[model samples]
Target chain A: ADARSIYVGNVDYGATAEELEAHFHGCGSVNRVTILCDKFSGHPKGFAYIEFSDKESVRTSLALDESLFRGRQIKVIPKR
Target chain B: ADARSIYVGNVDYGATAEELEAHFHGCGSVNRVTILCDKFSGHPKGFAYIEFSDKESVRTSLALDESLFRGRQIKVIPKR
Candidate 1:
């Protein structure tokens, strides 16, 4: 919903929010990681949201596009 | 949708598919370039897509990681 946040996607359902946080936080001054999920099953909603405060990182992180983690291909889309 | 296709993105609205095709095709035997766009406005969807059949380019392309074109940051993701 804002420029500060980027949509993180194509993640394995079992991946934890902090895992992604730990993964991408170092790339920027991350604000947080929010993974959407089913309330009952608690499985990943298939993606997460990552927001950062660094200008260079925000620009640089887009390079992380199509990056690999845990054998999964993920998407990082900036807010339009 | 397959390994042959690598998603290309983070492009300027006025950018051309051939331009990117020329930029990356040399790295591999690129099949095609697809840039998503606004159906009504005719504006670039702000990214491009590619399908290729090769090795070093696909591998080295990832490290193009954070590369630039015309001052805009670019993204290169394999088909998810």
Candidate 2:
């Protein structure tokens, strides 16, 4: 019940932070949605970090970890 | 001599992209500097990706792979 962060990968480059928040909202209160950038290209790299308000949210979020979102099955790995 | 991109990690979050370009300038013509950011927080992480104009630049980059800069020793790993 300590950690509430999750690693989301293989995301769509076009997905916005607000959309990510909305997608994970069903699980629980999402605190943050940080998408990784291709520092050189200034483009999204299909990965991000999501922080939840509680451990339970993180747990529920993983249920749909590999589920399809906008044509991509995102990998949801929880951080310990 | 085909690879020209390098993965830079353990970088000082405070370091600027220009600083990275300057740090690696001696290696060769650095094409671009892309720093990863915390999607939600909008803050720079301790890593980045840099692309060079030629593979030889990547070679010169690795020379300073474990070199220290601005208080942190960054790791420079080639894509392939």
Question: Against the true structure, whose TM-score is highest?
Answer: 2
Pairs that collide, model 1: B8-B48
TM-score of 1: 0.42
lDDT of 1: 0.58
Candidate 1 lDDT by residue in tens digits, A1-80: 25777777766534544456566766777654544422212333346566676555666677778988667778887855
Model 2 chain B: weakest 10-residue lDDT segment is B37-46
Clashing pairs in 2: A33-B40, A34-B39, A34-B40, A35-B39, A39-B34, A39-B35, A40-B34
After aligning candidate 2 to the native by TM-score, how far in Å is the CA of B75 from where it should be? 30
C-alpha DockQ of every model: 0.01, 0.09
Worst 10 residues of 1 chain B by lDDT: B36-45
Please tell me which predicted candidate would have the highest lDDT against the true structure.
2
Q: Which stretches of candidate 2 lie over 4 Å from their true place?
A: A39-44, B1-80
State the local distance difference test value for candidate 2: 0.68
